[PDB]
Amino acid sequence: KHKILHRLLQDS
Amino acid sequence: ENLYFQGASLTEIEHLVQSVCKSYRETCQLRLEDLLRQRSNIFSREEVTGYQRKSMWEMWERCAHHLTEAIQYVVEFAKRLSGFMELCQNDQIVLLKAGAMEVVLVRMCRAYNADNRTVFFEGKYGGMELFRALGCSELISSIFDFSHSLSALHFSEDEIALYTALVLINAHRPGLQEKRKVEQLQYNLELAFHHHLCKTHRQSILAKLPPKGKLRSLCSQHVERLQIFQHLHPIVVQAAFPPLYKELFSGG
Ligand SMILES: CCS(=O)(=O)c1ccc([C@@H](CC(=O)NC)C(=O)Nc2ccc(C(O)(C(F)(F)F)C(F)(F)F)cc2)cc1
Numbered sequence: 136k137h138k139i140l141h142r143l144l145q146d147s
Numbered sequence: 148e149n150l151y152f153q154g155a156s157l158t159e160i161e162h163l164v165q166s167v168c169k170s171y172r173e174t175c176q177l178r179l180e181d182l183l184r185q186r187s188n189i190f191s192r193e194e195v196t197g198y199q200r201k202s203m204w205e206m207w208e209r210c211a212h213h214l215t216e217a218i219q220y221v222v223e224f225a226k227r228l229s230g231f232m233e234l235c236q237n238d239q240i241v242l243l244k245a246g247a248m249e250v251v252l253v254r255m256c257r258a259y260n261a262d263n264r265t266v267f268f269e270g271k272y273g274g275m276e277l278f279r280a281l282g283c284s285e286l287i288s289s290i291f292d293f294s295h296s297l298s299a300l301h302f303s304e305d306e307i308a309l310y311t312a313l314v315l316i317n318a319h320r321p322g323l324q325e326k327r328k329v330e331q332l333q334y335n336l337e338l339a340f341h342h343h344l345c346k347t348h349r350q351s352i353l354a355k356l357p358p359k360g361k362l363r364s365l366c367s368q369h370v371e372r373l374q375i376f377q378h379l380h381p382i383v384v385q386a387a388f389p390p391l392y393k394e395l396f397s398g399g
């Protein structure tokens with residue numbers, strides 16, 4: 136259940 | 148939330164063309180000049196044989212890793228696209244899950260040489276025979292045919308920038324909560340792309356762009372072939388495929 140998209144989106 | 152979620156004027160559409168082309172230039176992954184220059188660096192018969200002797204699982208792992216790297220640049224392109232960060236997180240994820248691979252497939256035509264039917268992979272150009280160990284020859288052939296058809300359009304970098312922004316901002320993706328916001332953003336990006344084509348006397352490509360069903364079919368075949376590979380080597384996918392790749396193509 137990998138969830139990387141939310142991390143990439145939230146990282147600024 | 149964003150000017151492009153409502154009606155935009157001609158001056159605002161001109162500003163949108165510049166903005167999209169800038170977001171693309173900053174996230175294009177490899178420069179076009181760098182890809183063109185390397186066209187003369189082609190894998191030898193011995194090197195092709197070496198790739199064909201690699202195991203199916205090691206080739207699948209290498210291709211998934213390189214695709215994941217390309218997808219990461221598409222995620223960054225989306226983050227820099229006007230309006231995208233103003234959509235809700237549910238919608239950002241819906242659009243990236245459905246469209247990231249489609250954008251990568253479009254961008255890939257830049258790395259495809261129609262003169263000898265080769266693609267840039269791991270430092271040199273190789274034909275579809277380079278990937279024979281994957282055991283998904285129909286999918287590879289379909290990707291090469293698609294790349295060949297886009298290559299015949301002679302896309303400029305600015306045309307790829309505007310066309311890929313539209314591939315991503317598709318208000319028809321199932322699961323979008325703010326569908327009207329996405330429709331208005333898509334309408335403005337469509338005007339930006341068509342304005343640029345009009346200004347550059349390139350409107351003849353509009354009837355020549357592939358149908359949406361074509362990118363959908365390539366994405367469906369990719370997921371189907373991955374499911375077949377996963378049934379054969381489940382622990383390879385679980386232990387050695389990138390987590391982002393699995394989130395997009397194998398439900399986690
Ligand atoms: C897409 C953005 S761009 O044009 O800047 C750009 C093109 C090609 C590469 C190479 C880099 C590389 O090789 N780094 C080690 C690249 O990623 N090439 C590749 C990867 C994957 C495939 C396939 O899975 C499929 F299916 F996408 F074509 C394949 F053929 F192996 F099955 C093809 C080419 C990088 C960047």
Ligand code: NA
Pocket residue numbers: 256257258259260261298
């Ligand atoms: Na090309």
